[PDB]
Design a protein around this ligand. Structure first.
Ligand code: CA
Ligand code: CA
Ligand code: CA
Ligand code: CA
Lengths: 108, 108
């Protein structure tokens, strides 16, 4: 769903780097895919895509499927990867990621 | 923000019909703009656009600005219009519209 927003080549490179189980790193991904240099606006658009059910939060099953929003056939993150990603972004400890937590996670 | 999803002509007709203060009717708008025949998926995409801050709910100030998501220079809804729209869609009475309430509002 990041057709004319990211860059096909950027997404491909990002995905190739984390193909191995437990090799994912959110900072490396965001930087490579080109999201870190985006406007708060486009970051909110990205958030909405990742929030599959539009609940206003990225819950753990949505996070597990993170890569699939970029390339449909991308692998699922491992439990370890998901938990690490969740822990890094979940500032208030409610177990999900809201738009502000997501924005801080992206912008670093 | 409904560039290749709606139809320029549909949006224009929809907007012309409710230009007068208190002339808005959500069922007439949705039918005219072509949202009622959309897949639950595209309806969720529309929801996300209307939910300006990505909180997961369309709050009353967002509802007031409903038309502005279709054409940037569209008028704001009146208080009467907003309240009526809110009342029609807010099934659980919490004062905001969640994705499921929005979907039912669209599909009729
Ligand atoms: Ca969600
Ligand atoms: Ca949180
Ligand atoms: Ca909102
Ligand atoms: Ca409600």
């Amino acid at each position: 769903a990041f057709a004319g927003v990211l860059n096909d080549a950027d997404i491909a490179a990002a995905l190739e780097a984390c193909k191995a189980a437990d090799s994912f790193n959110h900072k490396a991904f965001f930087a490579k895919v080109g999201l870190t240099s985006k406007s708060a606006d486009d970051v909110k658009k990205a958030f909405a895509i990742i929030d599959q059910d539009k609940s206003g939060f990225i819950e753990e099953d949505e996070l597990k499927l993170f890569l699939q929003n970029f390339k449909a056939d991308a692998r699922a993150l491992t439990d370890g990867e998901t938990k690490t990603f969740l822990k890094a972004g979940d500032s208030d400890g409610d177990g999900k990621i809201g738009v502000d937590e997501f924005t801080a996670l992206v912008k670093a």
